[PDB]
RNA sequence: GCCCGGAUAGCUCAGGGUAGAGCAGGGGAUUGAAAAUCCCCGUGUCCUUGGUUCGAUUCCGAGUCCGGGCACCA
RNA sequence: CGCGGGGUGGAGCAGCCUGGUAGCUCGUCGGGCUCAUAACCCGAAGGUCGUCGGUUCAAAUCCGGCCCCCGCAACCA
RNA sequence: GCCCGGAUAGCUCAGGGUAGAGCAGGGGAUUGAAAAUCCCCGUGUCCUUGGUUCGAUUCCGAGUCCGGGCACCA
RNA sequence: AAAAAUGUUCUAA
RNA sequence: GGCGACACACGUGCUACAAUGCCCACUACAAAGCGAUGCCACCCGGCAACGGGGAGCUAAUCGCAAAAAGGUGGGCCCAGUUCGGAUUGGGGUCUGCAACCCGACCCCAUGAAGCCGGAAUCGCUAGUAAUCGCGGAUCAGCCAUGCCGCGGUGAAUACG
C-alpha cells in the first residue's frame, strides 16, 4: 500500500480447538469458498494424526508449522540498476503465511488419493523435519546463506 | 460436467428437464 | 473376444464393462442386465458361465452392435454423399454438418491448423 | 621392436579403507531479456581377466585400446 | 579432347574423403513486446543434392559421359 | 571473316499444351487529401523461316539484328 | 548515480 | 439467397482436463424480478422433450419455484476413466405460413481434443476475489456460454 500500512485481518478462532493458527490453515485448504469441506479435511486429517502415532493433534500441527517458518529469504533489489538476490530476515507475520501456504502446497504434492490423508502425512513428516514444505524452507534458507555477500544491499 | 447434457448437472445448465433431470 | 466380439474388461462392474462395446451406452447397459437378472454391481470377473451366455445372448440379439452398426452408420453417410444433398457435401469436403460456423473453430472436423501467410501492413 | 604412460560421469581431470570435483544437461530463484549469478539434482565393472588383501579405483600380473618417446629400414 | 576447382532449401557455407544420418548463419512464414516499426523473444515451414548413365541391398557421397561456372598454363624458337 | 551468347507487352527481364512478371499507366480499397502499402485491369501472331511432335515461345537447322572475343613474324 | 535506434508529404483546425 | 462462407489470424467468453472430483438417491437455506391468444397448481398419456385435461391468480393471496454449491447415504479407485462432452448416425418434440441453407430442446447410439498450457499476458484490497445457482430486458421461437441485475458460500495479501 502507498499511504498507510495494511492492517492485519484478525481471524476468528475455530470452534474445535479455539485457535487462530488453525483457521488460517483451514483458509489455506479452502478453494472456491467451500469452507465446510475445507474444515472436514483438516479435522479428518486431525483424527488420523491421533491414530497414526498417538499424539495430541494440536501439538503435531504447530510443530510442523514451527519447522516450516523460514528465518531468512532472498528478496530483489535495484542499486545502480543491477538486481541481485539480497538476503533479508522474515517478519513473523510472513513466516506464518509462508508456512501454511507451503504446508498445503507440500501436502497436495503427495501421492495419496484422499485429501485429509495428504494433509495428515505432510504434517506428520514436517513436525519431524521431513517432507515437502521442509525441503522448501531449508532450500530458501540455504539460498539466503549463499548470497550473504549481498547482505549489505539490505534496507 | 455442465456440458454433459445427459446428466442432472448439465440439465441444470441448459435449464431444461428430462429423464436425466425430472421434476 | 467374449461379447460381442470385444472382451469387455474384467475387474469392472458389468454395467460399465458393457459400455466398452460400440453400440452400448450406459442406459443400454442398464437394460440388458435388468432384463436378465444379473446384479449391475457384479464384477465381470465374477459372473457365471451361465450368466456370460445369458448376458451375451440378449446383448447380441436385441440391438445391432460393433461392426454392423459401423456398416449401417457408414451406409447412411455414403447415402447422403451419393445423392448430393447438402449434408453429403459436408461429409465429403470434411466440414461440419449440423449448422456450426466454420470461420473460427470446427477443428474436431477440420483437424490440425494449417497456418498460412497473411496480408501485410505498410512501413 | 624397446622404454614411459594413460583409460575413472556425457567432455575434462583430480585420487590399500569414497568411487570423486569442474563443465555440459534438469528444473527452481533472478531481469525486459542474453546472461553472469544463486540453488538443488542426477551422469560409473575406474578398459578386460586372474591374483593380493578382511576388504579393491589403488598393489601385482596379463592382454585390449589410445597416448608419448627411442631406435631402425634390407 | 592443355591442367585444375566448383554445382546441395531463397542467399552464403558444412556434409563427399570413410555409401545408410542432410547440418550452420541469415533469410521466409505464424505468434509475442511496442502507440507503431526495428531490434529482441517464442514457434514453424522450405533441400528428392546440375544432369544422364553405371556399380551396389542402398548413391548428394563411388565410378564414366554431357551441360554450366570460375582459376591456372600456353615455354625454346 | 569464324565460332559462342542475347531477340517475349510501351519499358526492362523471367520462363512441350499461346505464356508471366515487376515497371510505366488506369480504376478500387486506404487517407482529410496524398505518399507508401494491398487488390483488380489492359497488356504479346514470344524476331522470320524449315524440321521433330497430336501439339513448339520451350527441342533442333537456317535467315535476320545486336553482343564476347581470335589473328603476321623473326 | 543513466541498457535500448527510429516516426513519409502537406495541413493544426 | 446472403449477413451463418473458411487454407487462415486476433480479441472476449463457456466447458473442462478430475478424487477438495464425478455419479445416483434422500434432504435443507435465498434475493431480486416476471406473469390475462400471460404464469401455469394438480391430474392421466409418454423413458423424456412434450401432449391432453384442468384449478388459482387481473396477483405480499395463485403460478414461474426446483434455488444450486451445501448436509446425509451409497457407488466409481487414478484409467484419456463412471474425467471431458466435441463430432457424427438414427429417432422424436415444439414454436412458426415455413426450421435445406440456418432454430431450440429431448431420447438411443457415437464418446474427439484435452494429463493444467511457449514467448507473452488479465482481474481483484473484503463480504472483494473465487465459486454456486436465480431472475429480467429483447423475444413466435432462438443459436444467451452475451448483457443488466440478484443473493448463497466465502479466502489469501499489502514489508514497502
Ligand atoms: K633458348
Ligand atoms: Mg458423465
Ligand atoms: Mg460403448
Ligand atoms: Mg455456418
Ligand atoms: Mg538452389
Ligand atoms: Mg544456396
Ligand atoms: Mg570431406
Ligand atoms: Mg559418412
Ligand atoms: Mg537444416
Ligand atoms: Mg515473422
Ligand atoms: Mg493515436
Ligand atoms: Mg515489430
Ligand atoms: Mg527446423
Ligand atoms: Mg557427374
Ligand atoms: Mg542417401
Ligand atoms: Mg628456358
Ligand atoms: Mg573470306
Ligand atoms: Mg522487350
Ligand atoms: Mg483516392
Ligand atoms: Mg526456329
Ligand atoms: Mg535477312
Ligand atoms: Mg541483313
Ligand atoms: Mg545492320
Ligand atoms: Mg531510417
Ligand atoms: Mg501540399
Ligand atoms: Mg490461437
Ligand atoms: Mg462465450
Ligand atoms: Mg479465449
Ligand atoms: Mg424459469
Ligand atoms: Mg476416450
Ligand atoms: Mg493424448
Ligand atoms: Mg466417459
Ligand atoms: Mg441427426
Ligand atoms: Mg433453421
Ligand atoms: Mg491424470
Ligand atoms: Mg494456470
Ligand atoms: Mg481500490
Ligand atoms: Mg465448477
Ligand atoms: Mg426469450
Ligand atoms: Mg448453433
Ligand atoms: Mg441467465
From Swiss-Prot, chain A:
GO terms for molecular function: rRNA binding; structural constituent of ribosome; tRNA binding. PROSITE patterns: RIBOSOMAL_S7. InterPro entries: Ribosomal_uS7, Ribosomal_uS7_bac/org-type, Ribosomal_uS7_CS, Ribosomal_uS7_dom, Ribosomal_uS7_dom_sf. Keywords: Ribonucleoprotein, Ribosomal protein, RNA-binding, rRNA-binding, tRNA-binding. One of its GO terms (biological process) is translation. It holds the Pfam family Ribosomal_S7. One of its GO terms (cellular component) is small ribosomal subunit. The keyword rRNA-binding applies. The keyword Ribonucleoprotein applies. SUPFAM superfamilies: Ribosomal protein S7. It comes from the Bacteria. One of the primary rRNA binding proteins, it binds directly to 3'-end of the 16S rRNA where it nucleates assembly of the head domain of the 30S subunit. Is located at the subunit interface close to the decoding center. Binds mRNA and the E site tRNA blocking its exit path in the ribosome. This blockage implies that this section of the ribosome must be able to move to release the deacetylated tRNA. Part of the 30S ribosomal subunit. Contacts proteins S9 and S11. Binds to the C-terminus of IF3 and to the C-terminus of Era. Belongs to the universal ribosomal protein uS7 family. This is Small ribosomal subunit protein uS7. It comes from Thermus thermophilus (strain ATCC 27634 / DSM 579 / HB8).
Swiss-Prot record, chain B:
One of its GO terms (cellular component) is ribosome. GO terms for molecular function: rRNA binding. InterPro entries: Ribosomal_bTHX (IPR031414), Ribosomal_bTHX/bTHXc/bTHXm (IPR030826). Keywords: Ribonucleoprotein, Ribosomal protein, RNA-binding, rRNA-binding. The keyword Ribonucleoprotein applies. The keyword Ribosomal protein applies. Residues 1-12 have a biased composition (Basic residues). Residues 1-23 are annotated as: Disordered. It holds the Pfam family Thx. Binds at the top of the head of the 30S subunit. It stabilizes a number of different RNA elements and thus is important for subunit structure. Belongs to the bacterial ribosomal protein bTHX family. Part of the 30S ribosomal subunit. This is Small ribosomal subunit protein bTHX. It comes from Thermus thermophilus (strain ATCC 27634 / DSM 579 / HB8).
UniProtKB/Swiss-Prot annotation, chain C:
InterPro entries: Rbsml_uS13_C, Ribosomal_uS13, Ribosomal_uS13-like_H2TH, Ribosomal_uS13_bac-type, Ribosomal_uS13_CS. Pfam families: Ribosomal_S13 (PF00416). PROSITE patterns: RIBOSOMAL_S13_1, RIBOSOMAL_S13_2. One of its GO terms (cellular component) is cytosol. Residues 94-123 are annotated as: Disordered. Keywords: Ribonucleoprotein, Ribosomal protein, RNA-binding, rRNA-binding, tRNA-binding. GO terms for molecular function: rRNA binding; structural constituent of ribosome; tRNA binding. One of its GO terms (biological process) is translation. Located at the top of the head of the 30S subunit, it contacts several helices of the 16S rRNA. In the 70S ribosome structure it contacts the 23S rRNA (bridge B1a) and protein L5 of the 50S subunit (bridge B1b), connecting the top of the two subunits; these bridges are in contact with the A site and P site tRNAs respectively and are implicated in movement during ribosome translocation. Separately contacts the tRNAs in the A and P sites. NCBIfam families: uS13_bact (TIGR03631). Part of the 30S ribosomal subunit. Forms a loose heterodimer with protein S19. Forms two bridges to the 50S subunit in the 70S ribosome, contacting protein L5 and the 23S rRNA; these bridges are straddled by the 5S rRNA. Belongs to the universal ribosomal protein uS13 family. This is Small ribosomal subunit protein uS13.
